[PDB]
Design a protein around this ligand. Structure first.
Ligand SMILES: [Fe+3]
Ligand SMILES: [Fe+3]
Ligand SMILES: [Fe+3]
Ligand SMILES: [Fe+3]
Lengths: 205, 205, 205, 205
């Protein structure tokens, strides 16, 4: 008996492809340091949980909440970064405006891409601390629901798909923007992969 | 422009169908009071968010984090309870052991249903405070991942489906079990809807 | 080497002294079940932590975050309930209006006890889930700062003293008020121990 | 009616006094950017809360949880950084080993400063995400309680004094140590102000 381990996905572009909006220095450590660290951390804990399940670790030799809470931290750390890389593209291919159905829903619910952009930016800058800003597609209501996550595992909405995701941990921008998080959020719009977001939305109609 | 509102789903059985494991007194207020309250609370906040989007509420007339955090609380409050009702069934129809593919995966990852049951129960009783105990089916790894949520919105794992869900807020058992949460968890196994769980799993293979 | 253990403080009155606002049925289990449970849970974890410190538990035989997070949960569970009991008194001795310096500060910062009462009640009813509503006395600014805690350990403000504290976990009122939390908050004002609150404030000037 | 505002305390040394353990580049933005930002953010929200109290903001023109949760974030952001600066000192004056009563309690509870150092370091490196590592002096039990905070406001223990505090947000070390948080924690011991910690402990006996 065992659990299947997670694998680090390949970066969809060169570490310097997002310049000048996100320097290669950040991407390098962000992918090779942080993201790889969550794949390793998750697998390491799955291994430890396997021991609890098999009985190799007896009662009193582990503290279940430490393992379980550590898994949601690392597993989300991995899954969220995987979505992040795919949600961005080299400028010229990335940025601009959305089209297809995504553009349509945005117009019906926010009035226009420009208004949506303002509301999302405002919401992302209000996040108290480290976390993420995401745009969900609620398969139940059909709403494009904005949400801010605290850390990697707080504030999620169950089961629904993530269409847009912005990493707001300080490591995602500090080396280049320092404490100017807002400038980072502003620069981010220039590398958003609207094509990828459109394709993901299509899967859920 | 507007957001679509949420609707209270009908209870799949009589309020006394889960007796003697969960009294009708609890089910009545749990469904008609708590769950209905989250549908209303979510819709009320969507309405307020619409005003922010349209501009009927000017800057300084709202505090975005209060609205956004309130939405994850109420929306999850609604979605999680909807899953909860469907995850249980009258004794005789509910409880017992799982079959099909779900039984298979449990045997491969936990060794047996009996061991799985022990680990899930142990994990559910370790939750510090109010929350939920769930069994996920990670579409990425194929793992049946156990997890405890704190409140309705903390500790989730992004996008993956929930196969088993146990409400661990005090209102789910207090009237009948008082502070004996563990007795409630034990009684719960007798009403689990394994058929429904099996069907949901099939959707993701 | 060892850590000193916590002790369950005696209830300052009979379990039925708060009736008809809080029934003896609630007080009994709240004190003898819940509060006692946190003293025991804290002491149990301190002993486990002692083993980690002494080396009786080797690396790989414990998960530090499970122990540390479990301690903040149980220790606050204990400390907060101890403050709660002392912050109430039988109707006649309790309830009414505050006097002395506490009354003074309330008038200067909120305009009147009436207005303060409205703002505190509004804030307490807004808490998303289980937690506490407290009134701090910030020794740095001199402000009587209102705050809502989530669970027993989230949202605290470092080092400053708690003057007023209201338990908002469902177990504090469910048996008598069911899901009508707001009715519980309103009834609570009739048993507040303003004299005790006044004495605590005096200690910090 | 009004609330008193917070003031940015002066840094107890030159921005380059902690080198080579913490570069002046970090201290500069950490104090002039981040800490100043929390004093401003707190004061800004107190003024908004004043408007709610006075009635200048009517119901429907604010979302109380956004204000209250924003205050615990900013107020702790301020208070915790104030403690942080005072808890360090230039190499020579800082670092080394503790003496007086603090040294005594450490020996009685951890066996030795060396062992204490290992346990604190291990605990600090286990923090899942951004936060703080602190050493409390519980006035109730007399225990020197270790604790990790998540963000600036989660996991605190009510009312007790903080003796040691280590900032573990990425901004406290990223520019110099990048993702090597552990190297930062090790370097930190060389600038700890044991004299200041000893004096604070004395106040509580
Ligand atoms: Fe990141
Ligand atoms: Fe519930
Ligand atoms: Fe309580
Ligand atoms: Fe900091």
């Amino acid at each position: 008996i065992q659990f299947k381990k997670y694998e680090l996905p390949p970066l969809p572009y060169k570490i310097d492809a997002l310049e000048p909006y996100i320097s290669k220095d950040i991407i390098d450590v962000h992918y090779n340091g942080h993201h790889k660290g969550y794949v390793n951390g998750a697998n390491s804990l799955l291994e430890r949980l396997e021991k609890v399940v098999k009985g190799d670790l007896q009662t009193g030799q582990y503290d279940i909440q430490g393992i379980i809470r550590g898994l949601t931290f690392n597993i989300n750390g991995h899954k969220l970064h995987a979505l992040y890389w795919e949600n961005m593209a080299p400028s010229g291919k990335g940025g601009g405006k959305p089209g297809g159905a995504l553009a349509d829903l945005i117009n019906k619910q926010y009035g226009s891409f420009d208004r949506f952009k303002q509301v999302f930016t405002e919401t992302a800058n209000s996040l108290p601390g480290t976390g993420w800003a995401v745009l969900y597609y609620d398969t139940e209501s059909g709403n494009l629901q904005i949400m801010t996550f605290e850390n990697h595992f707080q504030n999620h909405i169950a089961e629904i798909p993530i269409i847009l995701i912005l990493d707001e941990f300080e490591h995602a921008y500090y080396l280049q923007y320092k404490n100017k998080r807002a400038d980072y959020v502003n620069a981010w719009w220039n590398v958003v992969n609207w094509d990828a977001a459109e394709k993901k939305l299509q899967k859920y109609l």
